């Protein structure tokens, strides 16, 4: 017994809508990179629910995933299961949660059942001050309310303000003038490329940028972006990911094994027709399992929102930065717009630059240009030839345009000389990093092997 | 530890504790257990750290015990992640038994392929009611491609984890193309040509390959004659979509191809005297070798290309060389979706589904009217000017050009040259098949190539 | 009840599920094209399905589909009772004067059942995967396989012309 | 007998002929298909200047339940705010 709808002292509260947030989280681990975005702890209504999401936090940072089983042994040691509900309660929220369906909808509700539940209990204690002033000289009452209504704070992670300054950056600034450790006179700050030519324009790839490769199609677009990720996995020891959306997994390696090892592709195109080079094969096969660096995933239905749910489940369960390469981003589709490309690029411009600033990762994405370049008598790409795109001319931080003369001509003195036009450049000059196209082995060697320098 | 019927994800903990104690002691069971258990399988994050150390050392020609487990792990710094030798020694209690080890490589296999079938039945239910699928018919097209790619070699997961171990071995296992066909009848589905398959090296087996030709060029002549040399030759259920012809008109052409009879004979001066000898010859070899399937409906959205080609790959293995004649007839559900963006959702749903089924998808398109105002009338790349989105998202492109349809007294009569413009994993060239079109068959025993110097 | 109860309701568009039944009941020459894009068991609630089956072949079988020809065929079939009564037939006929945009309400009930049946497929794959009975991984990867392609949906004999029947060789 | 009054959206100005057709009240639904005597109102000297229907408005019937339709014209003195007698010109 209790009286009717006139009883409304429960301000809001959502307890039926809460157990189906822990319910599917009890039966899934792939969706903690979502509900933690929009439900943090101390939103739930009941105190036994807070200790569950309390120890769902430490196990996700320790890496140990959560079912009923790995939770209770992690609540046996910490002195819990006595005040969190008991081992029957975890089965009460496992038998009575049939929904293996949707958590991203009950998570928004507990957020907007708590903000309202807190702003009621703000106005029961600011409007308690006039209800009982016991004397604190009401000008000094006025900073209580600035401390009450702004105590709604959400400091779950890194950079914010308030506890933030410029001197709090200047320790991190002298932290990154702590170079000259590995390269006493030689090289680069961030992640390498591994060439005598490219490391004096970009000075390596900067550890939060978004370097865009662009090229006329099949004029050397994945010859570059795998050669560079070849050279940046023997040189970093980090999870250097790949999203090959265009090629299949079996066909990625059947150029990289011709490039790490420099066996010719005719020895891997047909049947292998040498037993000298098998050691050249098996050595670099062993090198590539000496270091378990290069990753691959060959999706082809990639929204740029489901990219984040791969490339964060590599940099969390393993090492750090790597080099999150994504091949050929027009094949990434956004189904939200289904519109002109001048908006479907704009979600990829605003999400790849929101993945290169969580994980501090140089996302080497790839694009191509429109066919009206093929009538411009100076075929070399400039920024005014990405007319299909829209916003990618601005959000990128390093834009490399790959001409190649011998694929658009046959009087080419640039025979095997792929050139790299740096279209955009944020933090340096622009220019021409001319390389030696030796894609017989899927290679880009350096032009100071040949005679001249990068004019 | 109460044992009850609850909703728990299926995994075993003792069984993972059972295997790791065996390979800690033994370095000789590694002959066995490396075959049937791979990484990404064990539940807790420290467990596959131990497994990679078991792999990096065993290739390095160094043993495995509780001693060397500490050695590289402090050269790699991961030792306090797994917990140091405080926890590895608790795995030094597990098994003196070198038996049930493959049986413990079986249960941890068995609780890990069911466990790869809860993150497919949540990659569907979190597409539904939170639409990253946005229409119903392309919400089923992602409800299939996370399911048919599971029903596979079953060392396959959904997508996302592929450590370079698990792709290097499946690369060398796909360079086991070494004892059969030492000649260049290359790994792809054959076309039946010893002029083509030196320049294409077969139709590479996961590639969207685009044919284009003018009208009055014989486009479906080549596309069935290539399939008829790839249906009685490579054992796989070759599906065919066709909209330029109706269903029976295709079969009236193929019987004029296989039986080498004239197609004027098939309706005028009918199947009468000695043509019965050849037609009843190829109505037996085609009768039960259940390869060529044909479907010819008119409204072919790129949703209902997949959802017809999934069944074909379901009932069989499926390297069905899908021939889709006349791609421009494929009509997307959105109509104000215009021709600059109609094909750009077809260019990126054939290439994105010539990849799951491992099928070399031959699709067919055509070049515009402004082709016919040039002098060198060859179909080149810059004359696919309907959309320009398929010119850049294909793998092999063959532009057909028959000379005597556009010229009269020149001596290249009956010499169709299949121009290979965009060749990705190989070099360019120029073929010359012999247009024997009264039966619509091609090969070059009468070979129009110079062949002398 | 509070309005967090929008949880077990796949979208199913009852307003778009009534304007089609008011579309055919006033216009008999729309069941030729509407029944193409829309089939039964896409209608969410039990009265709407069987009413659409009560038009069994009643395009050319000699019955212009109004409230009169329905009510006589209802009771010789036997369902003038509380699977619609007769007052709801007036709610389906006279309250729904709906226009010549039934083909706009046709694609809704095509596309709010596919998204609906992809929840019970997304349940019955998963709820089996928590209770493993006496059947192994060779069962569940082949029972999740077939249960997804039970949602083509069903239209007609298609997808396979020649050799399969092999008769489309012999139809030539 | 309930006279009700309503307005049209600017989708009509997309058409060249700005005569108010029946399918311009469909944009809210329950007014186009629950109307019994639609009487649209046109007037040309406000939409033009060189028209000779100046001050003479033409009520267009768009639907009628129990009779005919047509084009009933009325004259209107542009000072008194009074619509007036017969259909000013000849036809
Ligand atoms: N034997 C060879 N001779 C010359 N070039 C080759 C050879 N093998 C491969 N290539 C080159 O490899 C390149 C691969 O193209 P790529 O940029 O990967 O295409 P995409 O842009 O679709 O990724 C082709 O442009 C081709 O020129
Ligand atoms: N009796 C015949 N002699 C020569 N060619 C024929 C005959 N019957 C049909 N054909 C050819 O069949 C072809 C139909 O194949 P298709 O490739 O669709 O045509 P196109 O080459 O115009 O695209 C036509 O080009 C036509 O030349």
Numbering used by the authors:
A (entry chain D): 17 to 471
B (entry chain C): 19 to 471
C (entry chain B): 18 to 189
D (entry chain A): 378 to 468
What did the article's authors report about this structure?
To assemble such entities on DNA, bacteria use specialized loading factors that mediate opening of the protein ring, guiding of ssDNA into the exposed chamber, and, finally, sealing of the helicase with ssDNA trapped inside. E. coli DnaC serves as the helicase loader and delivers the DnaB helicase to the bacterial origin; it is unrelated in sequence to λP, the loader that operates at the λ phage origin, and which is the focus of this work.
We report on the structure of the Escherichia coli DnaB-helicase•bacteriophage λP helicase loader complex (henceforth: BP) by single particle cryoEM at 4.1 Å resolution. In the identified complex, we observe five λP loader molecules bound to the helicase at five consecutive DnaB subunit interfaces; the sixth DnaB interface has been breached, thus precluding a sixth λP from binding. The λP loader restructures layers in the DnaB helicase comprised of carboxy-terminal (CTD) and amino-terminal (NTD) domains into novel right-handed open spiral configurations. Furthermore, reconfiguration forces the CTD layer of the helicase into a restrained inactive conformation wherein the ATP hydrolytic and DNA-binding properties are diminished, if not abolished. Each λP protomer is comprised of a helical domain that binds in a deep gulley formed by an interface between two adjacent DnaB CTDs.
